[PDB]
Structures are given as structure tokens and as C-alpha cells.
Amino acid sequence: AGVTQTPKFRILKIGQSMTLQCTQDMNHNYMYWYRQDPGMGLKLIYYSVGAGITDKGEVPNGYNVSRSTTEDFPLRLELAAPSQTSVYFCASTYHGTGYFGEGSWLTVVEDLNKVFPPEVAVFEPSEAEISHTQKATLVCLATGFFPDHVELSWWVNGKEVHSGVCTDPQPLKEQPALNDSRYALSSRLRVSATFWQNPRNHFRCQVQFYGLSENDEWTQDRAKPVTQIVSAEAWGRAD
Amino acid sequence: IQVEQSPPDLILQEGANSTLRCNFSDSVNNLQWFHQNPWGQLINLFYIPSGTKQNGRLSATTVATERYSLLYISSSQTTDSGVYFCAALIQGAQKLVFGQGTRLTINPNIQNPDPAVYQLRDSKDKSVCLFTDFDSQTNVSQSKDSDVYITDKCVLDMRSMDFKSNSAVAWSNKSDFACANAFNNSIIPEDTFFPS
């Protein structure tokens, strides 16, 4: 299915290596790697005009690439530095039009003990909103997490729900001066008051966190913040 | 060498017609437009070296002689929100290089404002404040307090009821925290409902 890049999420300690995969099955010759920092444009790292051919882009330093085949254009980070924290996008072109992978969110940390799983809590609709609007807003708050490698979703009666949902576009920083401040992220699910006031209805906010792996060595006296799902739930409420 | 986009951002209402601009130097060509959605996925809008193209509600013109290109979005929908980039090939080189982007926010027309602030209890002592049902003209001020948190607004669509609404959320551990005070740190419309 198109340009596919892997991992979607990774945490590295300073000095470690990693390879970002990108595979393209459309027989495109021209392939590109970009990075994008928050709220910025895409900056070209390396590009390849065909199998066996690669050239430096705008920002190649600290990166390497290979193109032994038309299908694969791996990006290597040989020795991870904090400046390489970014989102990375691979693209191919054919006939002038570009096709992009989904992105790979990479965070490089100086110490793993700045990595934290989210705490998650659900806030139930207020009686006054129900009375006034005939609608019922649930709030999910996910707090205290680092990196911002999370996917928040709502599940109603066991099924992921998409309508009536709004998740903050940007997480917010608990300590805004700090470059590795832990984050807070809110979402809302709004339903008719009728649906919320049914005790048969089950509401769950889920945060999938992408954390450390067993390539990581953990020293701290807290649980190793591994990839994991933290949820919070509420039952519909008659009373 | 460089692709320059403008305006730095554009905020409009559902229904409005949008124009974005890209100026480029004489060492690039083969211009393209992309939309990047809030989830970070880039999708090509046009390959547009010169002439004008149409794609449903969207259109694009490149006057390569005048070294610019224009992207038109007609009858803007909330789903048009995102960042719009132009990109061009540095000449000779097949180096595909991007501008800084224009952020586009398309706001819903709130049929029936009922701006209100509500307190919501934790499902499992702990509560949050919800400011909701305001028209799109309202801005939601950042917290002027290190440990009161205020989110920016977001648009939620209740699809099967054809209903969109704005909300922002605020919370704090503070002992003297009031929903009365959370969004009155800001200001709210002439009529915000504050129950109890």
C-alpha cells in the first residue's frame, strides 16, 4: 500500500543507532527523506534518483542512506544526537507528483528517566449541560507523559468511535520552558443526553503510549515506561 | 534555491473562498502543492508547473514567468484545515525542496451560540472546566498562571445530528480553583452561562 515507513515511533538514547525503513512498491525511481520539526517545513536530508544512486540533501549531517534496490530507501542514524528529535517522512515521486509515507516520530533523549507513561482520567458530563443543551460532553485528560508519542481514542460499547470526538491538535507542556517537559492532552466526546443517561452504555478513553523497548536498559525504581495502553472508563448515568 | 509561501496563516469560516501564495526563485521549477493533515499525512494536491488545474473544490495556477503559484480552495470545509505546502525541484537537480507552509483553519458557522462554562467531575475531588457552545469569533486565551492549564479550542462534529461546536478545557490542582475563574482569566462573551 504505497510508500510505507517503519517504525512509526521510536525513542533512542544519545549515541544509539537506528534505521528508518521506507518501502515503495510502485517502481518509482526518485525517493527522498525529510525531517520536520514542530510547526516547521520539511527539510531534505538525502535523496536517490534510482537504485544504487544517492546524494546529500539540505541537511545530511549525522545521517546516512542506501538504495541497493528500487523498493527500499533506508535512512540510518549512526550515532543519535538530541538535534535528531524530529518527524521523518519518506517520499517517492513519479512524473512530478510526490507520494508520502505516514511519518516516523523519533525522540532522542540524554537520559531514559525523562520517559513517562500517561496518566488518564475521564470527566463525566455536567448535569447543567444536559439540562441546558440536551447534549453530554465527556472529557478525557492524559497527563504527565513524555515523549509525545501517543494515540488517543474513544471506545463506546467496545467499538472505536470517530464522530462527536475532538482531540487537541497539540499537546501542552506542563513546564513550558523545558525542552523535555512532560505533556497534557485532552479529548472530548459529545453524545446526546439520552445516550449518556443510559446505564447500559460504557465509555472508555484509551491512550496508546509508545515507550521504551527491551533494547533499553532500565535503572530507575519506577516501572519501566514501556509501550502500553492506559485507559479510563465511565458508565452512562441515569441519576 | 527557495520557495516562499504566504500568508503565514489563514483563518476563515466554513463557506469562504481561500487563496494561498507561493513565490519561488528562478532556479526552481516543477511546482507542486500538498496538504498535510493534523495527523501529519501529506497528500499531493497538484503537480502544477504552469497553467491552471482544478480538482473538485480546489484549483491551482502557476505563472512560471512571474515566478509564483496560487492555490485556491472553494467553499472551505472544516476538513480543509491543516498545513499547505508548495514544493519545487531545484533546476538540473531532482532535489525536491519545500516552503515553510501556510496553516489553514476553517471554522464552523455556529448556527445557535449558547456559550457556557461547566464543571465536570472525575468518574473515578477532581474536576475540569469546559467552555463550550461559543461562536467561532471567540478566542480561548492561554493560561496566565504556570499551573492552571487551558487548552486551545477545538471543533467537534456530531455527524448524525449535523451539529458542530467549539470547546476548550481547563484544569488545576489549586485549592481555590473555580470554573468561574478559569475562563474569566480570559474574557468570555456578553452572556456566558455559569450554573450554580
XYZ file of C-alpha atoms in Angstrom:
435
model
C 0.000 0.000 0.000
C 2.037 2.945 -1.331
C 5.082 4.342 0.491
C 5.369 2.574 3.783
C 7.699 3.604 6.544
C 8.556 1.931 9.798
C 8.750 2.317 12.921
C 6.062 4.952 13.373
C 7.508 5.736 16.806
C 10.923 5.348 18.376
C 12.870 6.545 21.430
C 16.693 6.475 21.335
C 19.236 7.198 23.993
C 22.048 9.560 22.835
C 24.622 7.579 20.919
C 22.452 4.669 19.829
C 21.721 3.708 16.198
C 18.540 3.081 14.365
C 17.418 2.528 10.766
C 14.222 4.045 9.469
C 12.714 1.806 6.832
C 10.862 3.079 3.813
C 9.482 0.657 1.145
C 7.755 1.660 -2.078
C 6.255 -0.974 -4.449
C 5.207 1.321 -7.330
C 8.549 1.167 -9.108
C 9.282 4.783 -8.552
C 12.882 5.778 -9.181
C 13.024 9.044 -7.278
C 12.939 8.756 -3.426
C 13.518 11.432 -0.614
C 13.954 11.609 3.096
C 12.767 14.679 5.026
C 12.606 15.753 8.625
C 10.070 18.206 10.026
C 10.330 19.929 13.392
C 7.010 21.051 15.145
C 5.295 23.812 13.216
C 8.049 23.964 10.553
C 8.538 22.972 6.932
C 10.127 19.763 5.557
C 13.897 19.868 5.137
C 15.570 17.401 2.709
C 18.117 15.010 4.300
C 19.136 12.639 1.442
C 17.607 11.710 -1.923
C 18.117 8.934 -4.553
C 17.309 9.204 -8.264
C 17.438 5.436 -8.708
C 18.758 2.163 -7.405
C 22.444 2.475 -6.378
C 22.425 6.281 -6.551
C 22.236 8.615 -3.529
C 23.001 12.284 -2.852
C 23.058 14.683 0.078
C 20.079 16.980 0.613
C 19.849 20.227 2.541
C 20.626 18.678 5.967
C 22.593 15.346 5.554
C 24.911 15.624 8.608
C 24.581 12.755 11.078
C 22.584 10.649 8.591
C 23.360 8.006 6.013
C 21.259 6.267 3.339
C 21.466 3.317 0.930
C 19.500 2.360 -2.118
C 20.540 -1.177 -3.037
C 17.108 -1.782 -4.678
C 14.333 0.316 -6.188
C 11.868 -0.716 -3.406
C 13.839 0.258 -0.276
C 15.467 3.525 0.828
C 16.650 3.022 4.424
C 17.743 6.061 6.472
C 20.454 5.313 9.028
C 21.102 7.410 12.248
C 24.518 6.057 13.190
C 25.035 7.890 16.495
C 21.904 9.530 17.834
C 22.105 13.188 18.937
C 19.364 15.265 20.691
C 19.065 17.510 17.485
C 17.818 14.481 15.581
C 14.492 14.538 17.594
C 12.049 15.151 14.734
C 9.407 13.639 12.499
C 10.818 11.895 9.470
C 8.946 11.440 6.179
C 9.953 9.381 3.214
C 8.509 10.185 -0.236
C 8.798 8.904 -3.873
C 7.907 10.851 -6.976
C 6.705 9.700 -10.334
C 6.079 12.116 -13.216
C 6.498 15.064 -10.903
C 3.919 14.062 -8.285
C 5.037 13.162 -4.746
C 3.771 10.300 -2.589
C 4.494 10.348 1.181
C 4.798 7.787 3.897
C 2.913 8.239 7.198
C 5.895 9.607 9.211
C 8.253 8.281 11.892
C 8.287 10.200 15.196
C 11.758 9.887 16.688
C 12.822 11.279 20.053
C 16.438 11.174 21.192
C 16.962 11.570 24.930
C 20.039 12.179 27.076
C 18.572 10.005 29.868
C 15.777 7.443 29.715
C 14.490 8.659 33.085
C 12.849 11.584 31.338
C 10.405 8.991 29.759
C 6.965 8.695 31.420
C 3.697 6.847 30.596
C 0.434 8.930 30.563
C -1.978 9.023 33.414
C -5.547 9.040 32.016
C -8.844 10.217 33.672
C -12.444 10.633 32.363
C -14.649 13.536 33.465
C -18.344 12.919 33.303
C -20.920 15.284 31.721
C -22.309 18.005 33.961
C -25.969 17.935 34.954
C -26.226 21.586 33.880
C -25.015 20.885 30.326
C -27.594 18.089 29.953
C -30.448 20.370 31.165
C -29.413 23.307 29.023
C -28.392 21.737 25.683
C -29.735 18.120 25.654
C -26.129 17.048 24.966
C -23.472 15.464 27.155
C -19.724 16.050 26.900
C -17.206 13.581 28.305
C -13.645 14.791 28.784
C -10.535 12.640 28.768
C -7.313 14.034 30.191
C -3.942 12.303 29.605
C -1.241 13.908 31.715
C 2.416 13.559 32.645
C 3.688 11.824 29.571
C 6.999 12.123 27.736
C 7.677 11.912 24.554
C 4.530 12.943 22.869
C 4.286 9.535 21.170
C 0.621 8.841 21.956
C -2.609 7.858 20.166
C -5.821 8.803 21.984
C -9.104 7.059 21.074
C -12.674 6.646 22.386
C -14.441 3.368 22.681
C -18.173 3.114 23.256
C -19.667 -0.274 23.997
C -16.402 -1.879 22.872
C -16.062 -0.147 19.453
C -13.874 2.692 18.466
C -15.930 5.850 17.833
C -14.957 8.739 15.470
C -17.951 11.053 15.359
C -18.538 13.544 18.159
C -14.851 13.454 19.088
C -12.351 16.267 19.313
C -8.711 15.688 20.413
C -6.335 18.678 20.999
C -4.118 19.119 17.906
C -1.073 19.975 20.053
C -0.288 18.552 23.470
C 0.505 21.063 26.094
C 3.664 21.406 28.174
C 3.347 21.113 31.930
C 6.623 23.110 32.125
C 6.726 25.343 29.029
C 10.358 26.490 29.454
C 11.655 22.926 29.208
C 12.520 21.117 26.039
C 11.608 17.728 27.591
C 8.661 18.886 29.706
C 6.095 16.187 30.233
C 2.788 16.840 28.350
C -1.026 17.045 28.963
C -3.516 16.224 26.216
C -7.339 16.489 26.290
C -10.103 14.990 24.245
C -13.912 15.388 24.212
C -16.612 13.004 23.250
C -20.032 14.596 22.934
C -23.249 12.462 22.772
C -26.976 13.195 23.090
C -28.042 13.393 26.768
C -30.262 10.419 26.035
C -27.250 8.196 25.208
C -25.192 9.314 28.270
C -28.166 8.848 30.620
C -28.359 5.128 29.740
C -26.585 2.902 32.436
C -26.149 0.232 29.684
C -23.666 2.451 27.858
C -19.968 2.055 28.578
C -17.489 4.806 27.668
C -13.676 4.355 27.601
C -10.912 6.794 26.709
C -7.767 4.966 25.604
C -4.254 6.318 25.309
C -1.775 4.116 23.470
C 1.690 5.234 24.581
C 4.811 4.311 22.620
C 7.610 3.982 25.154
C 10.857 2.124 25.751
C 11.695 -1.351 24.406
C 13.831 -4.261 25.628
C 16.728 -2.737 23.751
C 16.630 -0.269 26.635
C 18.263 -0.839 29.989
C 16.340 0.500 32.938
C 17.878 1.588 36.273
C 15.069 3.573 37.984
C 12.957 2.492 40.916
C 9.693 3.065 38.955
C 8.134 0.821 36.346
C 9.992 0.903 33.046
C 7.850 3.144 30.818
C 7.327 0.584 28.016
C 4.902 0.802 25.112
C 1.439 0.345 26.674
C -2.242 1.302 26.806
C -3.564 3.399 29.742
C -7.368 3.773 29.774
C -10.078 5.378 31.855
C -13.784 4.491 31.790
C -17.252 5.686 32.702
C -20.670 4.095 32.606
C -23.661 6.074 31.475
C -25.511 7.541 34.433
C -29.228 7.702 34.924
C -29.224 9.653 38.276
C 17.064 27.773 -4.220
C 13.970 28.804 -2.321
C 10.228 28.519 -2.172
C 8.416 31.192 -0.186
C 4.786 30.863 0.905
C 2.249 33.372 2.108
C 0.161 34.327 4.164
C 1.839 32.793 7.284
C -1.657 31.554 8.249
C -5.293 31.927 7.140
C -8.425 31.554 9.380
C -11.807 31.611 7.669
C -15.412 30.477 8.136
C -16.991 27.425 6.593
C -18.094 28.626 3.170
C -15.358 31.180 2.350
C -13.024 31.000 -0.688
C -9.323 30.571 0.106
C -6.197 31.764 -1.755
C -2.620 30.819 -0.787
C 0.525 32.047 -2.482
C 3.917 30.556 -3.264
C 6.801 32.722 -4.626
C 9.849 30.960 -5.920
C 13.293 31.782 -7.218
C 14.399 31.296 -10.856
C 16.459 28.203 -10.009
C 13.367 26.052 -9.229
C 10.562 24.610 -11.340
C 8.030 21.715 -11.459
C 5.937 23.143 -8.659
C 3.603 21.020 -6.548
C 1.064 21.638 -3.695
C 0.455 19.341 -0.741
C -1.980 19.256 2.180
C -0.609 17.982 5.488
C -3.432 16.832 7.757
C -3.350 17.289 11.593
C -2.110 13.683 11.825
C 0.950 14.621 9.742
C -0.004 12.811 6.499
C 0.986 14.644 3.348
C -1.165 14.171 0.193
C -0.381 15.787 -3.159
C -2.914 18.347 -4.372
C -1.440 19.275 -7.803
C 1.584 18.850 -9.977
C 1.430 22.398 -11.469
C 4.483 23.547 -13.498
C 2.392 26.176 -15.447
C -1.260 26.804 -16.359
C -4.333 26.217 -14.110
C -5.737 22.993 -12.778
C -8.953 22.041 -10.998
C -9.642 19.224 -8.605
C -13.211 19.357 -7.285
C -13.394 22.453 -4.990
C -9.659 23.077 -5.257
C -7.715 24.850 -8.028
C -4.118 25.937 -8.771
C -2.312 28.434 -11.045
C 1.405 28.735 -11.860
C 2.663 31.740 -13.676
C 6.215 30.463 -14.035
C 7.118 33.661 -15.909
C 6.158 35.691 -12.828
C 7.691 33.018 -10.543
C 4.609 32.427 -8.457
C 1.870 29.943 -7.977
C -1.557 30.320 -6.331
C -3.725 27.668 -4.667
C -7.489 28.263 -4.490
C -9.815 26.435 -2.095
C -13.524 26.996 -2.881
C -16.315 26.757 -0.294
C -13.958 25.795 2.505
C -14.913 22.918 4.788
C -13.632 22.283 8.339
C -11.816 19.264 6.864
C -9.653 21.616 4.777
C -7.781 22.582 7.984
C -4.087 21.666 8.014
C -0.879 22.995 6.582
C -0.474 23.674 2.876
C 2.977 23.361 1.301
C 4.370 24.106 -2.142
C 7.488 22.214 -3.252
C 9.706 22.574 -6.310
C 12.698 20.863 -7.942
C 15.925 22.752 -7.828
C 16.823 23.016 -11.564
C 19.213 20.404 -13.016
C 18.879 18.625 -9.651
C 15.975 16.372 -8.846
C 16.189 17.824 -5.346
C 12.623 18.340 -4.189
C 12.538 21.203 -1.766
C 9.569 22.644 0.306
C 8.360 26.045 1.547
C 7.614 26.738 5.231
C 3.841 26.129 4.827
C 0.659 28.116 5.410
C -1.561 26.953 8.329
C -5.232 26.947 7.302
C -8.002 26.852 9.947
C -11.555 26.558 8.725
C -14.042 27.415 11.409
C -17.632 26.194 11.634
C -20.536 28.629 11.452
C -22.170 28.018 14.865
C -25.886 28.147 13.987
C -27.012 28.841 17.577
C -24.380 30.047 20.132
C -25.119 29.185 23.781
C -21.745 29.986 25.274
C -21.453 28.297 28.730
C -18.895 27.072 31.340
C -19.492 23.723 33.064
C -17.829 21.755 35.811
C -17.187 18.075 35.128
C -16.233 15.644 37.918
C -13.759 12.782 37.554
C -15.527 9.465 37.084
C -13.105 7.715 39.498
C -12.341 15.761 44.442
C -11.029 16.032 40.866
C -12.681 18.132 38.171
C -12.158 20.004 34.935
C -13.891 23.080 33.377
C -15.481 23.012 29.966
C -16.126 26.214 27.954
C -18.458 25.222 25.097
C -21.089 26.332 22.525
C -19.384 29.659 21.752
C -19.276 31.130 18.212
C -16.051 30.921 16.211
C -15.198 34.581 16.854
C -14.266 33.693 20.436
C -10.572 33.123 21.125
C -9.523 30.979 24.078
C -6.691 32.722 25.979
C -3.665 30.832 27.245
C -3.297 30.427 30.984
C -1.576 33.370 32.672
C -0.644 31.035 35.552
C 2.132 28.419 35.484
C -0.140 25.719 36.978
C -3.562 26.429 35.567
C -3.870 24.656 32.200
C -6.040 25.919 29.388
C -6.379 24.071 26.073
C -6.956 25.842 22.757
C -10.373 25.500 21.195
C -11.380 22.573 19.101
C -14.283 21.719 16.768
C -16.251 18.615 17.348
C -18.699 17.326 14.752
C -21.754 15.291 15.870
C -22.173 13.824 12.442
C -25.608 12.278 12.554
C -27.147 15.427 14.078
C -25.383 17.741 11.608
C -24.018 19.673 14.629
C -20.584 21.264 15.207
C -19.488 23.024 18.403
C -16.376 24.634 19.860
C -14.909 23.717 23.245
C -11.891 24.435 25.395
C -10.928 22.676 28.636
C -9.140 23.986 31.770
C -7.981 22.269 34.972
C -5.799 22.660 38.078
C -4.878 21.085 41.391
C -5.055 24.513 43.114
C -7.234 24.764 46.236
C -9.005 27.953 45.135
C -9.726 26.792 41.590
C -13.105 27.840 40.217
C -14.644 27.337 36.780
C -15.997 30.796 37.462
C -12.338 31.890 37.351
C -10.741 29.534 34.790
C -12.005 31.280 31.651
C -12.620 34.649 33.329
C -8.811 34.748 33.463
C -9.621 35.383 29.800
C -12.847 37.098 28.903
C -15.935 35.282 27.574
C -18.931 36.646 25.580
C -21.610 39.099 26.900
C -23.743 36.126 28.013
C -21.756 33.065 29.207
C -23.881 30.676 31.265
C -22.285 29.861 34.673
C -24.550 27.379 36.559
C -24.668 27.382 40.443
